[PDB]
Amino acid sequence: HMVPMDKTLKEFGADVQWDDYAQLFTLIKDGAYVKVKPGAQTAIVNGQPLALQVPVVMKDNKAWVSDTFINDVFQSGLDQTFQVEKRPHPLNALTADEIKQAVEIVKASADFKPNTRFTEISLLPPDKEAVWAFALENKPVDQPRKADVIMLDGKHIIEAVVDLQNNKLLSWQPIKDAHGMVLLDDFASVQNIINNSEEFAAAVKKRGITDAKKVITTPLTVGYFDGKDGLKQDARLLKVISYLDVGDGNYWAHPIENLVAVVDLEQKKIVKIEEGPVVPVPMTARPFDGRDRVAPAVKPMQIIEPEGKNYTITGDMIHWRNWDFHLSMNSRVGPMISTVTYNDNGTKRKVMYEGSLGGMIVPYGDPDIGWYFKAYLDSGDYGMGTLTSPIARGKDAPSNAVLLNETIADYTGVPMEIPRAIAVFERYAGPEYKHQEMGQPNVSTERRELVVRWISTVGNYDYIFDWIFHENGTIGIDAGATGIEAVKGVKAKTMHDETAKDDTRYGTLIDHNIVGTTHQHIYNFRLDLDVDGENNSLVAMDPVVKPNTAGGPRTSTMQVNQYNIGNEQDAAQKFDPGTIRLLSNPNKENRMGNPVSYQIIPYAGGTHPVAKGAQFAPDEWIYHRLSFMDKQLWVTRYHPGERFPEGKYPNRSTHDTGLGQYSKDNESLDNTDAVVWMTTGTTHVARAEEWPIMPTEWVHTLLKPWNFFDETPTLGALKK
């Protein structure tokens, strides 16, 4: 007995092409490329024949398949993209069971309270060295699996550790002063409290709003202002910004400007209602979903790899040409790329022990009541792994991508499987190199890049991250920003209205009554690079114009200043893209006697204006609290507990406990295990082109092998 091919396969998630002339189906899904003919005894999977007991049936222009077709074909094994792991890698994430076990163990302390929530539950990372010894030497790591369990007990943070090998609780530790991040149920609470507010309904009615049920709230954190905002330092507070729902699916386009509510999550009450001038809510419909648009014709374009992929995913290990690395997922920072090696003619050479997003911030520049505190720390305050956006197959990533699911703990400590959470795809990136000697045959090779892509969405913005592995050893990291703008409601319809000048002082007027408030997007990446080992030094090479001292007619020459950067404080610096910064290994040279190095480029371009530093006066708290914002390059001594640019508990923090703290003591960076931090940002002055939805804007960073090799890396196997 059977079932409709077309519909089952759509559920399952495969693309389905019918070719009437060839009488042939082409089915695609991840590493599987399938061709089958109605009534044929065999199908084709990645070039390999597969026997069907029950062939595909055409019945009045309708295709029908056996109820096991989908397993028989895709589960077949002829799609070799995924292989199962012999020995579980030591950096594999907590599995659902492990998550479930950690939650039971802490629930069995006498201190657990049922209102408790989990801010993060994550592998406590074994020690770098055993991990490397596992990757390179296969030495089993013999210290036992532990998980970090970070709980929010009302407003207090407790950090618990559990040992899962032995099912026991190793530590339980309240963290004084620390506030927890925003959690999912906070969103509901806030909407709820506003809903139950007689007072709030009144503030709202007198700003033109007749149906309060129509008000969409959104929770922001309050930052820290040494009291100027009038808020007690030791309460769990969030500010609530409001929109009117008009039925166009875009409440973001209907700001109720100049109304703020401060909510005490513990009490579950609005403890304050800041109120300013009444600005009429912008009411014109502004859907971004296409509802009011003509869908034009597009000729199809497909990228296909009909014999399967060049990469192999074994458990979480990915192998691709000379690259090997381990890919996993954290609830706070998303993807983590670990134990990365480059296979040099047989021997795997170390490149990066662990790279991931460090943290990010999007701080605005308008002083008015609904804005002066607006600064999202997306990962740290909202948990970016958790808010991963499933990839939209074929659109969010190219049609030849393979899409992975990933499993993290949610806030109540139940596992959640994120479908299509990270995309992996190879892409053609132009010619790897070329020379066309005059009169001679041409020489050209293709360039191929392996991209790992992850998208996370926080309130209005959507961020995309690409980790790009060039065959020739380069590694790129790019962040793209898209979504909907945080807009300010204003009286001016055009720049000709009386108030336009005042309305547009902190942002562009991007639609009638709507201003795109200026702000920055500052990303930072924590790269624990071990260039061919962990003992590294940071080197500077500054191209300079020196006077010619060798005679002949030139007055000047191009020369370099090479010097070492001996310690943390000197390493925290602006990046001038005119200069070269290497992380060299001073114990290891290439065939020419040069320290094998990677070149570190925090700014390799972008589509928005670039952020030169924090767009804040040096006396702003946000400035005081987050130094990572103002240097492009930082290097610190390896420290397992040092992970976040913004610091570990940044909600309403009062000092810098991130990169400022990590480099406070100004330690030696000479010939020692370093961690690199790249900060890169844009400064976003808006324009109509970005409204009601912003075209994706991109920044790029780059890491390039610098005399890490002896020659053109992609020349090929030597046959002599």
Detail the residues annotated as belonging to a binding site for Mn(2+): 528, 530, 673
Query: Residue 332 Cβ, how far from Cu ion at the closest point, in Å?
Result: 22
CA 613, CA 708: separation in Å to the nearest integer?
Answer: 31
Q: Which is nearer to its own copies, 174 or 277 (CB)?
A: 277
Let me know: does 597 contact 583? Beta carbons within 8 Å: yes
Contact string 34-73 vs Na ion (x = CB under 5 A): ----------------------------------------
Exactly one of 334, 335, 480, 650 binds its own copies (CB under 8 A); that residue is 480
Q: What is the DSSP letter of 410?
A: -
Question: Which residues within the stretch 322-351 sit at the binding site for its own copies (CB under 8 A)?
Answer: none
Return d(Cα 647, Cα 209) in angstroms, integer.
40
Site for its own copies in 357-416 (CB under 8 A): 364-369, 372-373, 387, 389-390, 392, 394-400
**Which listed residue (35, 179, 326, 521) binds its own copies by CB under 8 A?**
35
Using the minimum distance from each CB to its own copies, give the nearer residue, 165 or 442: 442
Minimum CB distance to its own copies, residue 635 (Å)? 19
Torsion of CA 568, 570, 575, 576, to 10 degrees: -150
Contact call for residue 435 and its own copies (CB under 8 A): yes
Regarding 288 and contact with its own copies (CB under 8 A), the answer is yes
CA 416 and chain centroid, separation: 18
**Could you say which of its own copies, Na ion, Cu ion, none residue 664 binds, taking C-beta under 5 to 8 angstroms by partner kind?**
none
**Whole-angstrom distance, CA of residue 225 vs CA of residue 233:** 9
- Residue 149: beta bridge partners? 121, 160
Whichever of 248 and 530 has its CB closer to Na ion, that residue is 530
Give the residue ranges of the annotated binding site for substrate: 376-387, 458-463
Of its own copies, Cu ion, Na ion, none, which one sits near residue 247, judging by CB under 5 to 8 A according to partner kind?
none
Q: Which residues between 531 and 550 bind its own copies (CB under 8 A)?
A: 541, 543, 545, 547-548, 550
Binding part of the chain for its own copies, among 100-108, 118-126, 152-160, 224-232 by CB under 8 A, reads 224-232
* Least distance (Å) between residue 608 CB and its own copies: 9
Chain centroid to CA 17: how far? 33
CB closer to its own copies out of 662 and 706? 706
305 binds its own copies (CB under 8 A): yes
3-class secondary structure per residue, 616-678? CCCCCHHHHHCHHHHCCEEEEECCCCCCCCCCCCCCCCCCCCCHHHHHCCCCECCCEEEEEEE
Decide: 699 and 478 in contact? Cβ < 8 Å: yes
The yes-or-no answer on residue 461 being catalytic is yes
Should residue 443 be labelled a site residue for its own copies when binding is judged by CB under 8 A? yes
Per CB under 8 A, 11 contacts its own copies: no
126 vs 459 by CB, closer to Cu ion: 459
637 near Na ion, rule: CB under 5 A: yes
Residue 407, helix vs strand vs coil? strand
Within residues 242-261, the interface with its own copies by CB under 8 A covers 249
Residues 6 or more apart from 587 whose CB is under 8 A from it?
Answer: 533, 535, 671
Pair type for strands 42-45 and 32-36? antiparallel
Q: Is 368 helix (H, G, I), strand (E, B) or coil?
A: coil
Task: List 328's β-bridge partners, or say none.
Answer: 336
Helix (H), strand (E), coil (C) string for 440-503 = CCCEEEEEEEEEEEEEEEECCEEEEEEEEEECCCCEEEEEEEEECCCEEECCCCCCCCCCHHHH
The per-residue DSSP string of 524-552 comes to: EEEEEE-TTSSEEEEEEEEEEEEEP-S-S
Exposed (0-12), middle (13-18) or buried (19+): which is 436, by Cβ within 10 Å? exposed
584 is a site residue for Na ion (CB under 5 A)? no
Residues touching Cu ion, count (CB under 5 A): 1
Instruction: Name which of 164 and 231 has its Cβ closer to its own copies.
Output: 231
Binding residues for Cu cation: 519, 521, 684
The answer, yes or no, to whether the previous bond of 398 is cis (omega within 30 of 0) is no
Name the residue with tokens 């209102």: 115
Nearest CB to Cu ion, comparing residues 349 and 684: 684
Number of residues that bind its own copies (CB under 8 A): 175
Residue matched to tokens 């945080």? 486
Q: Which residues 103-142 are close enough to bind its own copies by CB under 8 A? A: none
- 591 is a site residue for its own copies (CB under 8 A): yes
- The CA distance from 6 to 582, in Å, is 54
Q: Which of 33, 411, 461, 603 is catalytic?
A: 461
- Contacted entry of its own copies, Na ion, Cu ion, none for residue 691, CB cut-off 5 to 8 Å set by kind: its own copies
> CB neighbours (10 Å) of residue 60?
4
Q: In this complex, which beta carbon is closest to its own copies, that of residue 200 or of residue 382?
A: 382
- Beta strands 311-314 and 82-83 are parallel
Rg from Cα positions in the chain: 28
Residues in contact with 717: Cβ distance below 8 Å, sequence separation at least 6, in sequence order? none
Among its own copies, Cu ion, Na ion, none, residue 591 binds (CB under 5-8 Å by kind): its own copies
Q: Residue 637's binding partner, choosing from Na ion, its own copies, Cu ion, none, with beta-carbon cut-off 5 to 8 A by kind?
A: Na ion
685/509 Cα distance (integer angstroms) = 10
Q: For Cu ion, give the closer residue by CB, 670 or 697.
A: 697
- How many other CB atoms are there within 10 angstroms of residue 463's CB atom? 26
Q: Does 356 bind its own copies (CB under 8 A)?
A: no
21 has catalytic annotation: no
CB of 99 to Na ion, least distance (A): 29
The site for Na ion, by CB under 5 A, has a size of: 8
- 3-class DSSP state of 203: helix
Stretch that binds Cu ion, among 364-372, 560-568, 651-659, 680-688 (CB under 5 A): 680-688
Among 335, 355, 380, 473, binds its own copies (CB under 8 A): 473
| Closest approach of Cu ion to the CB of residue 519, in Å | 6
- The bridge status of strand 146-153 relative to strand 415-435 is unpaired
Question: What is the rounded distance in angstroms from the CA atom of residue 516 to the CA atom of residue 510?
Answer: 6
Interface with Cu ion (CB under 5 A), residue from 374, 648, 652, 684: 684
How far apart CA 680 and CA 34 sit, in angstroms, is 42
> Using CA atoms, how far apart are residues 508 and 518, in angstroms rounded to an integer?
8
DSSP lists the bridge partners of residue 418 as 406
Site string for its own copies, 52-71 (x = CB under 8 A): --------------------
Under the criterion CB under 5 A, does residue 636 sit at the interface with Na ion? Answer: yes
- Cβ 4 to its own copies shortest distance, Å: 23
- Using CB under 8 A, which of 76, 569, 573, 579 touches its own copies? 579
> Does residue 567 bind its own copies (CB under 8 A)?
no
Which residues in 638-667 contact Na ion (CB under 5 A)? 662, 667
User: Which residues inside 520-539 make contact with Na ion, applying CB under 5 A?
Assistant: 528, 530, 534
Query: Which lies closer to its own copies via its Cβ, residue 113 or residue 719?
Result: 719
Q: Which does 110 bind (CB under 5 to 8 A by kind): Cu ion, Na ion, its own copies, none?
A: none
248, 316, 378, 503: the active-site residue: 378
Site residues (CB under 5 A) for Cu ion? 684
Site residues (CB under 5 A) for Na ion? 528, 530, 534, 636-637, 662, 667, 673
Just list the catalytic residues: 378, 461
